[PDB]
Each structure stands twice: as C-alpha cells, then as structure tokens.
C-alpha cells in the first residue's frame, strides 16, 4: 500500500547510478501526484541506516554480488520470473531485516548492470519489479516487525 516503499527504492538506486557517473533525471519517465524523495526527517533516517548497511556489505562482498548479478536475467518477460524464484530462495531461511539488506543491494546492482549494458530504459521497470515484490511479501512482515522506523533504530 504505502508509496514510501518506492520513494526509498529510488534513492539508493539513483545514488548507485550516480557513483557509476549516470543521471536518474534523464532516465525518469513522468512525476505522479504528491510527496518527494527521502530528504525530510524520518524517511531520510531510514535511507541513512540502509545506505551504510549496503555500503559496508559492498566493500566486503563486491566479488560475490557482482557474480550473482552476472547469472540473473534482467530483460522484460523472463527476468520478472528469474528475479522472483531467486528472491523467494534468499528469504527461505527467514524474512528477517538482514535478508532485506541483501534484497535491496542485489536489486540496486541489477539496475546498474542494466544501464552498463546500454539498457537504461529498464531503470523504471526493474525498480517496479523489486518494489512490487516488497509490497506483495515484505510489507506485512515489515509492519509486524515495527516498520522501517524500527530498522533505523536497530542499524543506524
């Protein structure tokens, strides 16, 4: 339900694309209705805790996650199935906040791999694929576990 799930997905994607030298403002389609990116207060605190959690894991495991994105298909059609079956496996040990750190970090790296392959138009679709999964499976577990506001109090 909550549109904030997409707003915090856009931020860590757009930052990873900016570190590769790319521009989200050129890839973005059309603005929807209301509310902006996480630059305020409590949503900016989620973003900050989540960014350090991704950045430390990317230092220690750059090789592992780059080899994991190399086998995953990212083109429309088969990718929507190829992503689902792999994400349903990485949460199979538990739906915990530690596996949510891996889920977002993998999705952000897949978006980069698409732009780097000259498939920049998919930045909108790959972001929707992970945000739709996050609404379909994680959102009720996230709210039962105190929301992203609890994640920043645990990991910030």
């Amino acid at each position: 339900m909550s549109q904030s799930n997409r707003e915090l997905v856009v931020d860590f994607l757009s930052y990873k694309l900016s570190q590769k030298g790319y521009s989200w403002s050129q890839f973005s389609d059309v603005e929807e209705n209301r509310t902006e990116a996480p630059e305020g207060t409590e949503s900016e605190a989620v973003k900050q805790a989540l960014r350090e959690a991704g950045d430390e894991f990317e230092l220690r495991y750059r090789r592992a996650f780059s080899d994991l994105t190399s086998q995953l298909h990212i083109t429309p059609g088969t990718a929507y199935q190829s992503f689902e079956q792999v994400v349903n496996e990485l949460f199979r040990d538990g739906v915990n906040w530690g596996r949510i750190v891996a889920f977002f970090s993998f999705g952000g790296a897949l978006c980069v791999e698409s732009v780097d392959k000259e498939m920049q138009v998919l930045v909108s679709r790959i972001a929707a694929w992970m945000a739709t999964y996050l609404n379909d499976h994680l959102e009720p577990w996230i709210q039962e576990n105190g929301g992203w506001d609890t994640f920043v109090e645990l990991y910030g």
Partner: peptide, 25 residues
Amino acid sequence: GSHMSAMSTTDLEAYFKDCVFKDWG
C-alpha cells in the same frame, strides 16, 4: 554440489553461503 539445468548450484551454493562471515549491516 554438481550443476543442474534449472539452477547453477555449483556457483550459487558458493555466493549465497560465502556471506556467512557477516550477519549484514
């Protein structure tokens, strides 16, 4: 583990399991 046509287990049973040394974040 050996390879299967449905899942690259020889590679993925490494990368997913290799992360054991950090409980994320």
